[PDB]
Design an enzyme around this catalytic site. Structure first.
Site, PDB file in Angstrom:
ATOM      1  N   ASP A   2      11.137  -1.088   2.082  1.00 42.88           N
ATOM      2  CA  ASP A   2      10.493   0.187   1.177  1.00 42.88           C
ATOM      3  C   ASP A   2      10.648   1.392   1.149  1.00 42.88           C
ATOM      4  OD1 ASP A   2       7.041   0.070   0.225  1.00 42.88           O
ATOM      5  OD2 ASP A   2       8.387   0.448  -0.451  1.00 42.88           O
ATOM      6  N   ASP A  32      11.424   4.601  -6.118  1.00 40.81           N
ATOM      7  CA  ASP A  32      10.500   3.478  -5.292  1.00 40.81           C
ATOM      8  C   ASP A  32      11.210   2.202  -5.585  1.00 40.81           C
ATOM      9  OD1 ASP A  32       8.886   3.602  -3.419  1.00 40.81           O
ATOM     10  OD2 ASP A  32       8.094   1.826  -5.142  1.00 40.81           O
TER      11      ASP A  32
END
Lengths: 325, 325
Positions: A34, A214
């Site tokens: 992440d 992201d």
């Protein structure tokens, strides 16, 4: 290979995982990688929630390098919260190792049904320090300071469902992952990997919008208003968004800066759902409003574009990913 | 069987169909049977949209009983609009026939992707006259006036995915479809099959809410506010609603009147999606706001409860459906 490469596997075209180990005995774990968070966490053998019974668990008593901390901590994500305490032990990513502070998770009941319904054990953050809990220097940043890698940067060549696996590469940029020019975009904040880009889809446009690259977001998020106009006379309904995969009205996303131009054609944001209807496709686009016009360039964008996350230079590099290696 | 029975087949637990014919030569068609609308429509051989190429089409030139009308008309549904013109011909439902005014659809491009992605050819309305276009008396009402059926009522014993088929019965109530008491609820309007019921889920309640029994709605719709409170500390997330099928926090819907009590347990509104995650279930509930507190008791409710739609008595009869016939 002078760089550290970690193979990535796709999960139903909504997530992708990478493996790493914790402990002197190399306890194995599957991780969501992440760029939107900055902490590393693994479920503890002390976690006794139903979700944990199916996971690889971390047992600090089996590792000599384990350094007790115990500071209470809770981490929040879009899909929930996990709680536990800090611990420190040897973390191995690819062929590199280093003592690292992470969250030993004890309770995951506030992270369901995502946790039980998914195959990952924990999450490995690849964001900026100020974005973490406990002021922990990013793992790649740490590796650089320990002189274990040539540069404080990492790259993502994402896997593509039913096509090829991917790679998380730490320490250097390898040209084998991309074609065309590699363009850098300066960050507008040292918190998220956020950059400035002008966006144009149809007749609708937005100047210098904030764009967050992201890896933890499965879709491309767009400002509510922006989405509405974008899908006004396009034949795209929505069960109280889906459309025909051959819809020729579908627009192409256009993102431009002073140094580069990036586009996202329908083939990159349309997901096939034949099992529901013939030639039916789901729109991997989401309407999401931030205080200011923002786009989250998630996995759909990253699958098309190879990305470079540079801490030393505070920028994100973007280039067309090779269809095949 | 003194009544007219039409077998119903389930479609992925989101729709159910019934067959009927139009024309003197009995041209076959598959229909969505909609208590929420009042017109009958079939695609014309004159429809040249892509959606129509995969459907059974109606050719008026092959039927002696065809009576030209041509009045232009367009019909709207939740998922879109279809346009054409009125025509009249023999309509056969089960073992009953009668000349009936319907919409011959020419354009379906405003009804995509639903049309192409679904298996039905047209829609047969089972609502009230005032709810139709062209002031057409409901088909069941017509049959009663022609003395072809004993009563102006029809019943629904819905099919249950992977369990059993269903039946649309016209003209009479057959006890073989239900168990327990059959309770009648008076309509509060002669437009929709809407009745008044008190609702209680958890601690949340709502007095004398309007409840529409609708065969054309695949879910149970609930007032936005109502839903929020209902799913506050329940472990039910939602991709920017799904939950574990074994979630014991899941509440039971309770609907009561002066004459009856109806409940909807989680097993009736939870849809399995194992292919996405182990033990993962989708919540077949939707947040929808009407000008006044309203619940649409769609297929999830009707699958559990056998229903009677009485035009003569302006009421809806409700009883527990038999699990097996």
């Amino acid at each position: 290979s002078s760089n550290d490469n970690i193979e990535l596997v796709d999960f139903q075209n909504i997530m992708f995982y990478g493996d790493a180990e914790v402990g002197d005995n190399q306890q194995p774990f599957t991780f969501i990688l992440d760029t939107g968070s900055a902490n590393l966490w693994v479920p503890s053998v002390k976690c006794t929630t139903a979700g944990c019974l199916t996971k690889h668990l971390y047992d600090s008593s089996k590792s000599r390098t384990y350094e007790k901390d115990g500071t209470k901590v809770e981490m929040n994500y879009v899909s929930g919260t996990v709680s536990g305490f800090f611990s420190k032990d040897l973390v191995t990513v690819g062929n590199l190792s280093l003592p690292y502070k992470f969250i030993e998770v004890i309770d995951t009941n506030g992270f369901e049904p995502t946790y039980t319904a998914s195959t990952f054990d924990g999450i490995l953050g690849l964001g900026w320090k100020d974005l973490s809990i406990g002021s922990v220097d990013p793992i790649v940043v740490e590796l650089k300071n320990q002189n274990k890698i040539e540069n404080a940067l990492f790259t993502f060549y994402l896997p593509v469902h039913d096509k090829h696996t991917g790679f998380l590469t730490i320490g250097g940029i390898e040209e084998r992952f991309y074609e065309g020019p590699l363009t850098y975009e300066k960050l507008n904040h040292d918190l998220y990997w956020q950059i400035t880009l002008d966006a144009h889809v149809g007749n609708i446009s937005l100047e210098k919008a904030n764009c967050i690259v992201d890896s933890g977001t499965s879709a491309i998020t767009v400002p509510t208003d922006f989405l509405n106009k974008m899908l006004q006379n396009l034949d795209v309904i929505k069960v109280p968004y889906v459309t025909l995969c051959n819809n020729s009205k579908l627009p192409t996303f256009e993102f431009t800066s002073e140094n580069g131009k990036y586009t996202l054609e329908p083939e990159y944001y349309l997901q096939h759902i034949e099992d529901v209807g013939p030639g039916l496709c789901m729109l991997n686009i989401i309407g999401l409003d931030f205080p200011v016009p923002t786009f989250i360039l998630g996995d759909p964008f990253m699958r098309k574009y190879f990305t470079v996350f540079d801490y030393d230079n505070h920028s994100v590099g973007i280039a067309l990913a090779k269809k095949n290696l």
